[PDB]
Amino acid sequence: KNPKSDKFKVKRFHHIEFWCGDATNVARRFSWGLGMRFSAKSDLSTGNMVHASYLLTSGDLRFLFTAPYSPSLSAGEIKPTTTASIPSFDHGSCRSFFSSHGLGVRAVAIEVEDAESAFSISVANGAIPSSPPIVLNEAVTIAEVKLYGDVVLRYVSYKAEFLPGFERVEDASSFPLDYGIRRLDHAVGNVPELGPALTYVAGFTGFHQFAEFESGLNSAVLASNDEMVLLPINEPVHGTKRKSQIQTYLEHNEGAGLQHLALMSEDIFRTLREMRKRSSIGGFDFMPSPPPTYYQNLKKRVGDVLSDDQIKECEELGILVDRDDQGTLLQIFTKPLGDRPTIFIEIIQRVGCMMYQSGGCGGFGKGNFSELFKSIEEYEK
Amino acid sequence: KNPKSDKFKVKRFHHIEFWCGDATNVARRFSWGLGMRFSAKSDLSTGNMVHASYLLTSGDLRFLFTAPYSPSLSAGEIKPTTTASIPSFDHGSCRSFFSSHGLGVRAVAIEVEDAESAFSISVANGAIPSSPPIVLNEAVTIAEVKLYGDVVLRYVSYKAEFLPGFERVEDASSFPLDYGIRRLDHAVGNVPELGPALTYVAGFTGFHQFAEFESGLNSAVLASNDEMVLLPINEPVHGTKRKSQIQTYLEHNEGAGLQHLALMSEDIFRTLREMRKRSSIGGFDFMPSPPPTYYQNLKKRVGDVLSDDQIKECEELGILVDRDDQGTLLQIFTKPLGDRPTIFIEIIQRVGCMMYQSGGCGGFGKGNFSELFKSIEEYEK
Ligand SMILES: CCCCCn1ccc2c(C(=O)Nc3nnnn3C)ccnc21
Ligand SMILES: CCCCCn1ccc2c(C(=O)Nc3nnnn3C)ccnc21
Ligand SMILES: [Co+2]
Ligand SMILES: [Co+2]
Secondary structure: OOOOOOOOOEEEEEEEEEEOOOHHHHHHHHHHHHOOEEEEEEOHHHOOOOEEEEEEEEOOEEEEEEEEOOHHHHOOOOHHHOOOOOOOOOHHHHHHHHHHHOOEEEEEEEEEOOHHHHHHHHHHOOOOEEEEEEEEOOOEEEEEEEEEOOEEEEEEEEOOOOOOOOEOOOOOOOOOOOOOEEEEEEEEEEOOOHHHHHHHHHHHHOOEEOOOOOOOEEEEEEEOOOOOOEEEEEEEOOOOOOOOHHHHHHHHHOOOEEEEEEEEEOOHHHHHHHHHHOOOOOOOOEOOOOOHHHHHOHHHHHOOOOOHHHHHHHHHHOOEEEEOOOEEEEEEEEOOOOOOOOOEEEEEEEEEOEOOEOOOOOOOOOHHHHHHHHHHHHHHO | OOOOOOOOOEEEEEEEEEEOOOHHHHHHHHHHHHOOEEEEEEOHHHOOOOEEEEEEEEOOEEEEEEEEOOHHHHOOOOHHHOOOOOOOOOHHHHHHHHHHHOOEEEEEEEEEOOHHHHHHHHHHOOOOEEEEEEEEOOOEEEEEEEEEOOEEEEEEEEOOOOOOOOEOOOOOOOOOOOOOEEEEEEEEEEOOOHHHHHHHHHHHHOOEEOOOOOOOEEEEEEEOOOOOOEEEEEEEOOOOOOOOHHHHHHHHHOOOEEEEEEEEEOOHHHHHHHHHHOOOOOOOOEOOOOOHHHHHOHHHHHOOOOOHHHHHHHHHHOOEEEEOOOEEEEEEEEOOOOOOOOOEEEEEEEEEOEOOEOOOOOOOOOHHHHHHHHHHHHHHO
């Protein structure tokens, strides 16, 4: 059941912004590791004396990497005279975020019809304001409310290229990397208490709970009207045999924050081949592969969706498979993206639910907790 | 003239340590961009609850990348009970360094006969102490004194593998990259006033001035007894037509600090081919190439050292050439390594001065200031 209760018109995920200590080095690492092209910049070379921001794109996926310069470069400025291209940016907030959480997501940005009204309606419905609506060059409006921890939900709306003040990088520095990633499927938060987080966020968005179907967590998924904006949230479950991975996150992250980004690939096998080629030469590492018994058991579960060859291709690459009542989900998780065991990335591809493909086709892999523990001791054999 | 006045026995450059906000991402970027292998780690997986430190090596060159974890992970510890593998590390110092300077070099480490005596003699001769000698697992002694800005000169000495507490990374994660870089040739500091910096450092080391031979700088080189440890220092010259690059550094770095690291390659042409292949896919960019007239003029200057083919190979790669009375220097500079126009890297190869090759053979490229401005307007033509 989908009551379509969005309190304002939401379009799609627009971008994800990482707050960094050095944006250059994170952005170059991510570009190579994920096959994302450098497509826009806002920094000293564009007149920005406040922050360095670099945009990577792959298909519709937009990753933004931002770090502060010395406050001394902009000490003469005031907000009316700012050279920052993202007016919500604040040196103190950014340094405090990074020193508290390390590398991580500051903003989950979604495109809306009207960022001003989305902000007003949100705050009228319980949202904690973070940065009021600001119109940039009479062309783009940006506003932010608190989502969880120090993560903001950023609204962006266009009258009618990323943001004003951002320049198109030179072609020479813009190598057309592409490993098949195409869009952000969902963005997941970890919190100490799921109930209040859900009540808060569903309260000010009107997002509805997306229907699904002891591993140390409970979770739920909030979704927009067409269920293309998907915001799952986890809480830990205490007292389990193995310590909850959610609690470990909260400890190392110093509280709530974004846990993982799920990136849809138009060809997950090519994406994983390309990413795994680069794991040891600057890219990303992947979780340990499931035992061969997990893949033996794939025949009974998805033998009507994937061929034996395509199943063997899953086994080569360590891909996991789960199935809804409506679709099939292929997924795999990276190891943490940085020093701390906090944020990581999921690569996914969904099969089924054609009408375009509807959102969340195949679910989020809930069945892979059980099946993996069913593969752990079956493989002990 | 070399008075050989070292006040303690110095061996070679041992390592360079970068203080980072996220060590993982900088280290992976540097590994790919420079062709350096992951060779040791000290982090959560090795019992270090304080800092994450990753060591890259290429030949004898050792780059260490270190970032702090949340202080909460080690809040119960005291220095006697610390899990840090580098006991001079301090969360507050590291966060303050990175927030003040951005990504940069915290420690220039040299190997000495006896780090305890080097520290004592240094402090007895004016050195400002930074971290007293500490013996690690009865095997390695480490001590630090202030060099300039927030950069320390680190002494390390071995009774008899990087440091105790560091583990040899797994082979799977240790891809044997190598683009031909083999050792650190020299490490250069920028300061507001050259005279006092020289007096201070030469004062406590006994290092002597290395004999050389309006561009906005004056400089001088301090050298150890066999002139294998080379520490040049720049100061700005004010009032010039083009604003001094040293002054721009001081402004963006918030004061003195390490300006560049010169890395000797055993085959600079292969190093530059390999680094330039990767500039736009995660590696390092290089300064704009000199005009073809600069390379036309190379025949008269070094036509007896380099063939026409080897000169054309310099032209393809943007390499600069200078000559001493004793040797020839091939060199090239990267663009800044991170967000700020502060630290960069020089790749060099020296030809001549065989006895082994003596230190500083060919100088440091002083003649390339004049020759480049002689190439700028000659090429205007
Ligand atoms: C040991 C490897 C497989 C672990 C089992 N496993 C299955 C899914 C899954 C997610 C995830 O993706 N969760 C999510 N995504 N959207 N909503 N939710 C709740 C995060 C961490 N481990 C997961
Ligand atoms: C526009 C491209 C060529 C610039 C001319 N150019 C020649 C050398 C050089 C150094 C350097 O390497 N300096 C040094 N190294 N050791 N000691 N010193 C003083 C640093 C910056 N620009 C330099
Ligand atoms: Co997920
Ligand atoms: Co140099």
